[PDB]
Structures are given as structure tokens and as C-alpha cells.
Amino acid sequence: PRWEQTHLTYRIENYTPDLPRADVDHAIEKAFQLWSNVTPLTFTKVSEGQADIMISFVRGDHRDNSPFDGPGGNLAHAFQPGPGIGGDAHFDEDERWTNNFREYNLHRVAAHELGHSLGLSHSTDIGALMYPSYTFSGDVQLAQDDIDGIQAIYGRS
Ligand SMILES: CNC(=O)[C@H](Cc1ccccc1)NC(=O)[C@@H](CC(=O)NO)CC(C)C
Ligand SMILES: [Ca+2]
Ligand SMILES: [Zn+2]
Numbered sequence: 036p037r038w039e040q041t042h043l044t045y046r047i048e049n050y051t052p053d054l055p056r057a058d059v060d061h062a063i064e065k066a067f068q069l070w071s072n073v074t075p076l077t078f079t080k081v082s083e084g085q086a087d088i089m090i091s092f093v094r095g096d097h098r099d100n101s102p103f104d105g106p107g108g109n110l111a112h113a114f115q116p117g118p119g120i121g122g123d124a125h126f127d128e129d130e131r132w133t134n135n136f137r138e139y140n141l142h143r144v145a146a147h148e149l150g151h152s153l154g155l156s157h158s159t160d161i162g163a164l165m166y167p168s169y170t171f172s173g174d175v176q177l178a179q180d181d182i183d184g185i186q187a188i189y190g191r192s
């Protein structure tokens with residue numbers, strides 16, 4: 036599954052009160068930048084309307100078939116490209132979201148969920164952003180496995 040268009044939009048529907056709004060926007064815009072730096076994709080943030088990728092902070096049963104589970108456990112989930120909810124990213128509001136090394140760094144999680152929004156599955160490489168359990172090294176960057184995977188779907192910049 037992949038997006039047919041290379042110019043996509045996203046919208047942050049709501050925000051967690053754990054961080055100032057600017058920090059949430061920054062964390063999300065930098066996560067998209069990681070993926071657009073190695074592919075021909077471009078991302079535009081819209082303030083209203085329906086976007087290709089809708090991001091929201093929600094808790095427990097939130098109208099999809101994957102209810103959240105409170106603090107810890109699953110931290111966020113996303114949907115592969117497609118119509119409707121395809122591409123959407125949901126972050127569990129019951130977690131403590133940070134901008135530093137304390138669990139759990141929003142930018143680090145957003146980088147992994149947007150990989151799913153673009154069509155990636157999980158990696159078996161512990162240094163990869165797409166590994167299935169959270170890791171935080173201090174500096175969020177794509178690993179070779181991450182680069183290889185997204186360029187296999189959209190080509191290289
Ligand atoms: C601290 N929680 C985790 O690391 C759990 C796995 C886990 C669950 C129970 C106990 C130990 C580990 N992983 C997730 O939340 C992932 C779910 C997911 O893949 N979304 O796309 C997202 C992270 C990789 C950012
Ligand atoms: Ca949780
Ligand atoms: Zn959800």
C-alpha cells in the first residue's frame with residue numbers, strides 16, 4: 036500500500052496538554068521532514084478540512100477498532116495508505132509526552148507512526164525507527180533499514 040500522489044497534506048486535529056502547542060507542531064513537522072529528506076515526497080500542513088494524514092491525541096475506545104490501553108503498553112498506532120482513515124496517526128493521550136529523553140518523546144514516536152502512514156511495516160533492526168518497541172537515542176534519525184524501506188516504495192530524492 037502506498038500513496039499515488041507525492042504531494043500530501045496533514046492536519047493536527049488536537050493537542051496533548053503535556054507540551055506547548057508549538058512543541059507538538061515542531062515534533063510533527065520534523066518527523067515528516069525525516070521522510071521527505073530521502074524521497075520525492077512533500078508535505079503540507081492544512082489548518083482545516085480533511086487531509087491525507089489526520090493526527091489526533093485520543094484515549095481508550097476512540098471510534099476505531101483499536102482501543103488504547105491507558106498508560107504504557109501501546110503508545111500510538113497508524114493506518115497504511117488508503118481512503119478514509121488510511122494514513123491517520125493516533126497517539127494515546129494517557130501517556131506522558133515529552134520533548135526530551137524522559138519517556139515518551141513525541142517526535143520519536145511520531146517518526147515511527149508516520150512511517151506506517153506512508154506504507155512501512157515493522158523492522159527487525161534494533162536501531163531502526165520502525166522497530167516495534169520504543170527506543171530513544173537522543174537524536175532521531177533514520178537508520179539505513181528505514182531509508183531502504185521508504186525508497187523501495189517512493190524512489191529517492
Ligand atoms: C512502551 N511500549 C512499546 O514499546 C510498545 C511495545 C510494548 C508493549 C508492551 C510492553 C512492552 C513493549 N510499542 C509501541 O507502542 C509501538 C506500537 C506501534 O507499533 N505503533 O505503530 C510504538 C513505538 C515503537 C513508538
Ligand atoms: Ca498506552
Ligand atoms: Zn486509533
Ligand SMILES: [Zn+2]
Nearest residue numbers: 147151157167
Ligand atoms: Zn508500529
